[PDB]
Amino acid sequence: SGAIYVGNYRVVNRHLATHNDWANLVWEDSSRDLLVSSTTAQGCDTIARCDCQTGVYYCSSRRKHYPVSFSKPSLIFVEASEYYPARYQSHLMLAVGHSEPGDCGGILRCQHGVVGIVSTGGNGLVGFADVRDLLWLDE
Numbered sequence: 001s002g003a004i005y006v007g008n009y010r011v012v013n014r015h016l017a018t019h020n021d022w023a024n025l026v027w028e029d030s031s032r033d034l035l036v037s038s039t040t041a042q043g044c045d046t047i048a049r050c051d052c053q054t055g056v057y058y059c060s061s062r063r064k065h066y067p068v069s070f071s072k073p074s075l076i077f078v079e080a081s082e083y084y085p086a087r088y089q090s091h092l093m094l095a096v097g098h099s100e101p102g103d104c105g106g107i108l109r110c111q112h113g114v115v116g117i118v119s120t121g122g123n124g125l126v127g128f129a130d131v132r133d134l135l136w137l138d139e
């Protein structure tokens with residue numbers, strides 16, 4: 001679990017969105033595993049606007065943060081869940097690191113701010129859904 005809070009927005013994995021998230025829907029993209037909902041309280045997370053390929057992510061299954069090198073956002077294969085079956089997920093970045101399904105929602109950050117959230121993983125790899133391109137999160 002986990003979310004990004006920026007301005008009047010809440011960013012979560014689409015497969016983990018709640019009834020409230022869907023009732024206050026701003027935008028969702030199944031191909032990215034992202035959903036953004038509106039909030040009454042003001043968010044203070046800074047979104048990075050950069051092309052960093054190094055950062056630190058939070059891993060709930062270990063109660064630890066890990067430094068990682070990660071790939072550029074691209075189209076990558078994702079097996080089936082109760083949330084999606086074999087398909088290409090766009091805007092995904094891979095890193096060598098530990099993750100378990102419950103790790104989805106952990107933030108990946110670089111010196112510029114929030115880069116994305118954990119969205120997949122498997123075989124010693126961790127996948128992050130990028131959010132740096134969503135320029136509208138700040139306006």
Ligand SMILES: COc1ccc(C(F)(F)F)cc1CC(=O)N1CCS[C@H](C(N)=O)C1
Nearest residue numbers: 033078081083084099100101119120121122
């Ligand atoms: C970070 O999640 C992990 C991590 C590891 C494993 C391992 F296979 F090893 F059991 C499994 C998962 C779970 C997973 O990847 N998915 C399920 C939720 S929807 C997600 C997607 N965005 O399509 C795909």
Ligand SMILES: [Zn+2]
Nearest residue numbers: 050052110112
């Ligand atoms: Zn950066």
